């Protein structure tokens, strides 16, 4: 089926330009029944539609963002893009691309049927910083985990055994430390019997810093 994927930097300096690209697969962007939109969600807040584009180039915008927002389409690469100028901290958000299905004869009716996974963008003067990854060592159920400390900006992703271990996994929300850097822990519970015989590895990815770390967690 139709699938959308956002891409672009997660960090943008103040007053500079935010750029994102949505890649469409499982269908052509040149469908006459579809429009292509961007919607954002600031942390802890609701959804805000930014604008939409038709495959032939026609665009429509949220009036409160029209002066800064530009949405274009590249039919060749099956992509559409968002440019948002003169950003400030108020533009820090998760940005989703979405397909808009339209139908009707006497009236254009719309709904958003397919969404991307969203791209986290942070407006900041600070430079990216990759996390340090430390084991949380276990001492019939045992808990073990990994501490992902001092990174910026969000997000990081954590996997266990390259995705082989998913049961009983809790990856906590990042906390903002007093240092102004983020930290989180990912934990998992396993049979205590397996400790020292089975190997557990956390896979940590922090895209903005191009950090990819695999940390083995050993007992005691």
């Amino acid at each position: 089926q139709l699938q959308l994927q956002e891409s672009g930097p997660g960090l943008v300096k103040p007053s500079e330009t935010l750029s994102l690209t949505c890649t469409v697969s499982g269908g052509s962007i040149s469908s006459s029944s579809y429009y292509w939109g961007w919607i954002r969600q600031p942390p802890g807040k609701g959804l805000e539609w930014i604008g939409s584009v038709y495959y032939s180039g026609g665009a429509s915008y949220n009036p409160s963002l029209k002066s800064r927002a530009t949405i274009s389409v590249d039919t060749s690469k099956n992509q559409f893009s968002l440019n948002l100028d003169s950003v400030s901290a108020a533009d820090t958000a998760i940005y989703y691309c979405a397909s808009i299905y339209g139908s009707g004869t006497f009236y254009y009716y719309f709904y958003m049927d397919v969404w991307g996974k969203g791209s986290t963008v942070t407006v900041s003067s600070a430079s990216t910083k990759g996390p340090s990854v430390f084991p949380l060592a276990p001492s019939g159920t045992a808990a073990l985990g990994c501490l992902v400390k001092d990174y910026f900006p969000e997000p990081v992703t954590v996997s266990w055994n390259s995705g082989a271990l998913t049961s009983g996994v809790h990856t906590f929300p990042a906390v903002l430390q007093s240092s102004g850097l983020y930290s989180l822990s990912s934990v998992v519970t396993v049979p205590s019997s397996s400790l020292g015989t089975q190997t557990y590895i956390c896979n940590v990815n922090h895209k903005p810093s191009n950090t990819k770390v695999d940390k083995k967690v050993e007992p005691k």
């Binding site: 919607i39 609701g46 709904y111 049927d113 969404w115 809790h170 929300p173 430390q177 934990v187």
Partner: protein
Amino acid sequence: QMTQSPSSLSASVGDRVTITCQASQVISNYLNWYQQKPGKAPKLLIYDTSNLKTGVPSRFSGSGSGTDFTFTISSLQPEDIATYYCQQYENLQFTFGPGTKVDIKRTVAAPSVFIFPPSDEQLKSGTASVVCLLNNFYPREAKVQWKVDNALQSGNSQESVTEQDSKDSTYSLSSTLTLSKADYEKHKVYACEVTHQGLRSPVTKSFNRG
């Protein structure tokens, strides 16, 4: 000036859940409903007021007309915890409602407590993070107190709580005590005391440095 009521609700598994939406004006375009689960993108459930998207469970429904609309879950299931948004398209603009957060109330459940010493690798860099884990409990409310050689701690710990679990509707909590390596080495007993309504009396997990 879209509205949604209530802003949040706690319902039992199996409860009939009804939430409301007010469009900013009498609608002409579709009134749609989206479900956004924690950490996920919004997902279309209902389009054109009452039509279920293909694949969407029949326990979900929508109704209403004019400016007043309703979204219903006939029998709430644990995986239905999410924020639900109504959405209009009028005056050439997509507008989403403020959203209604649905979570689940269930029976009290005691936490399982675990404590982790700092790793030797972190210690090499001059910092010690001591982590305490409270696993799979209900309700969300819990008290964690750090004790270092029986001295109560203050201002050097942070907590994080998971989103409600989509299967057993419980929470987990991590508390991290952070000290310099120098301060960490000045003490022997590191303990975390957990107070929770699922426990008869506080539970303490501890370790000895070295």
